[PDB]
């Protein structure tokens with residue numbers, strides 16, 4: 001069946017774990033290690049293939065690597081134009097967008113697009129704001145970049161990229177400042193879960209309604225967490241790991257929108273933060 005993959009991460013040191021969770025029966029699979037251990041990367045899926053993008057070996061990474069579930073093997077891909085630690089990614093029409101992130105002290109506002117069929121990256125219009133630790137979501141064939149840190153200020157702003165027009169517009173700001181939050185899309189809304197507001201790791205969660213242009217708080221998580229992994233599986237949000245301000249979590253919580261409830265449904269084989277997560 002479809003699995004929740006978690007790639008890389010950090011606990012005491014950069015990790016190369018690739019593990020996958022089966023919500024059906026609660027089991028965990030151990031898969032082929034990443035070639036280079038990394039945290040602060042992003043994960044995504046195009047055409048049934050899993051991609052690990054950017055991050056840092058703790059050296060910032062411009063790397064893109066593709067994992068094939070059917071062969072259990074990692075294959076290097078064309079690198080990005082620049083290293084991107086604390087990157088966000090989204091997928092539109094089988095193309096991977098690499099958003100923001102950092103190279104040393106350089107906070108990127110640039111964005112580039114990867115085409116698997118041709119193993120090529122191309123720059124598109126840059127964001128209106130530099131964003132590292134940015135959350136990314138794809139909705140109605142638009143790309144949203146949410147929160148982050150612009151090099152001096154932590155951000156509650158969000159903005160939206162129009163692929164056909166190749167341009168960005170700011171949207172309504174979130175209620176809370178969030179860097180390192182989990183951003184995903186569930187039933188036509190953008191969810192921003194956790195992250196760091198400049199003082200604390202957060203357990204609060206807000207969702208954006210694109211038509212009313214409003215961010216509304218929903219039920220908070222049980223654990224405060226920043227740099228959590230996030231994905232959507234069968235109509236539910238799953239968050240994985242993260243840093244709560246003291247410990248590297250192994251908690252995996254699951255949000256059910258029908259009940260507006262969070263519940264802890266499993267734990268990773270070891271606590272970690274800064275993972276890349278995707279489902280296939």
Ligand SMILES: COc1ccc(S(=O)(=O)N(CC(N)=O)c2ccc(N(CC(N)=O)S(=O)(=O)c3ccc(N)cc3)c3ccccc23)cc1
Pocket residue numbers: 009010039040041055056085086132133134148149179180181195196226227243245273274275
């Ligand atoms: C003061 O405590 C904090 C305050 C704010 C944040 S943050 O979440 O907001 N943030 C910075 C930002 N501007 O977004 C981030 C920091 C570090 C990362 N990692 C390493 C990396 N690749 O850089 S890590 O996950 O592996 C890791 C986390 C915590 C510890 N202790 C060690 C390692 C992040 C990875 C992804 C997204 C955001 C990351 C975090 C801790």
